[model samples]
Target: SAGLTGATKIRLERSAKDITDEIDAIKKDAALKGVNFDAFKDKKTGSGVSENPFILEAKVRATTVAEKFVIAIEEEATKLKETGSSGEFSAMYDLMFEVSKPLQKLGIQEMTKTVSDAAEENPPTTAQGVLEIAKKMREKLQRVHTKNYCTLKKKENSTFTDEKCKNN
Candidate 1:
């Protein structure tokens, strides 16, 4: 059976693991901060949602913290390719593309390379071909996401039981 081997692959996996750990930490911190901000934001002023000095200050600090985490994580992600780990890096981008789709589309683009360049260049010619392409892409994406961010939920499914990674 095929499996990851050799020094390079091993190093790549190590680097990927390190970056993912940092990314997960950052995400959790940001999520917690969001909850804090929401709670602070809901406090009523005399007339409306609190614009109190305390709330405003908290909001500004939370923004700063979130921005710092985002920058740090983005830098970590950029370093993955420098380690010659395209597969792992691509897997990271796969998640990022989904998480940041709205912002990316609104011109907050961070993806350095087109993820679907080859697919775009070779458009399917027929309806069946298009369906095949879709299936292949879904399988590829599922495997990538699962390897990076999920636990295998179904042993018997031929990589086929479900459509999305079961984030735990």
Candidate 2:
């Protein structure tokens, strides 16, 4: 005895769910390391190490996936400020190019070009110039919440009129 009409074979894939146990193991690791939400605010303090871009680059190298992309942008921006080369503007342009992809998601992609334009003139070569650019860059990044994806996602979703999906 057999079941069926004329039927085509179908392949199906099933993945596990309620994966909380696996996730909790990871959470436990971060908890053991004293992970906190605020620790990711800045480059050095957030990463629990020296804020130096070169050091941050090493961490970026050691990481995987999106973390590398984000930390790479951070390291590039940091390197742009720390270098003493006269070609600083060119490097700033490169950093801007790299940041364009990720920053586009936040709708602040234009700011990168603006920073590159600033770099092209009165660039950060001398100590005073470095200080000036660094201060301005910090202010701009903070104002736009460039690295704050939580807020950026909120902003991105704010335009939707659905009550359940409304901004918090």
Candidate 3:
């Protein structure tokens, strides 16, 4: 049941509520604090770590990937318009889950560590200061475009190695 709305939370219900809360809180905090995030970045943009800008940069990658990930399944569920069979969405779930394979990688946790490290350089206290940083990250993402990600590439199930996303 892809009844997940922008505010409805995830579709695969049960036991996943905690994860939902954590992510939602993150998004809220970022946006509430005026942090804009763009998704589908190729890789770490920082030439060097420990720079305070990289802190938000790392957070940008993490947050954008999260929002885009949810968008994928949200659309996925909507496309189920009239399902093929009872188990059609079983296949949907499988494909969707496979698509999410990259999301499960521990790199996110480690990346958070990178975020944490950079956070050490720049502690989290921003208001008008972050409005500028928010746009900085979001603009970089939107301009990058959604191509390489969620595009049409065959046999990508085995080739789902990239982090941003699969073929469009």
Candidate 4:
């Protein structure tokens, strides 16, 4: 149900609550992969490893979601200004985007597909079971891509860079 509004939002809200547990598990998986919150940030919340390391396409959608979230934040800020609530709340959220900058630069941004894919690929095994296959795939991709990236870095000045070196 990709409808713009209505019951879809209600369903999404319910699904979001259920997904929180899954998200926490994804966070744990990222921690195991050396890409947890501390992996990039000095200290932060809701920061974790990227799923599709080789693909920057995920951010296209995440950025769109983030922008919508920011718009809501701005509306909240306007209301706060008018009602004379603490303006600091607005600043706090603005800092959120700033904190995400480094990770975003590193292509560690979140993607909606990560969540949905995980849910679909891995169903709940137990009442408390929250494992997701898509999460596993993401972690596997992270390790593979990270290792490949590092391997290339090490081979930067070596004969390994030559195309025929291996087959020679």
- The residue-by-residue lDDT of candidate 3 on 1-168, one tens digit each, is 543434424443432343344444555656655433443255644322222333333443444544454444445444544433425434433433343334334123332233234345543243322223233333433322343232323235446565566333
Runs of candidate 4 exceeding 4 Å displacement: 1-54, 83-87, 94-168
Candidate 4 lDDT over 1-168, as tens digits, reads 212233534643453343234334445565565532333345322212243331223323233333333333334334434323224333423333443443344354353334335555544332222223323334433443343344444436455555432311
* lDDT value, residue 43 of candidate 4: 33
Candidate 2 local lDDT, residue 43:
28
Clash pairs, candidate 4, are: none
> Of the candidates shown, which would achieve the greatest TM-score relative to the real structure?
2
Give stretches of model 3 more than 4 Å off.
1-56, 62-66, 84-86, 109-168
The lowest-lDDT stretch of 10 consecutive residues in candidate 1 is: 103-112
Can you list the residue pairs that collide in candidate 2? 39-46
Q: Write the per-residue lDDT of candidate 1 for residues 1-168, one digit (tens) a residue.
A: 122335644654554455435444544665654433233232334211233233333323323322332333344443433433334444433443443342232121123233354347644333332333334433433333343223323333447755565553
Native-to-model Cα distance after best TM-score fit, residue 122 in candidate 3, in Å: 42
Estimated TM-score per prediction?
0.26, 0.32, 0.27, 0.27
**Residue range 37-133, candidate 2, lDDT tens digits:** 2223322243223333222332222222223233333444454445445564344334335544443432432556666677778865654554555
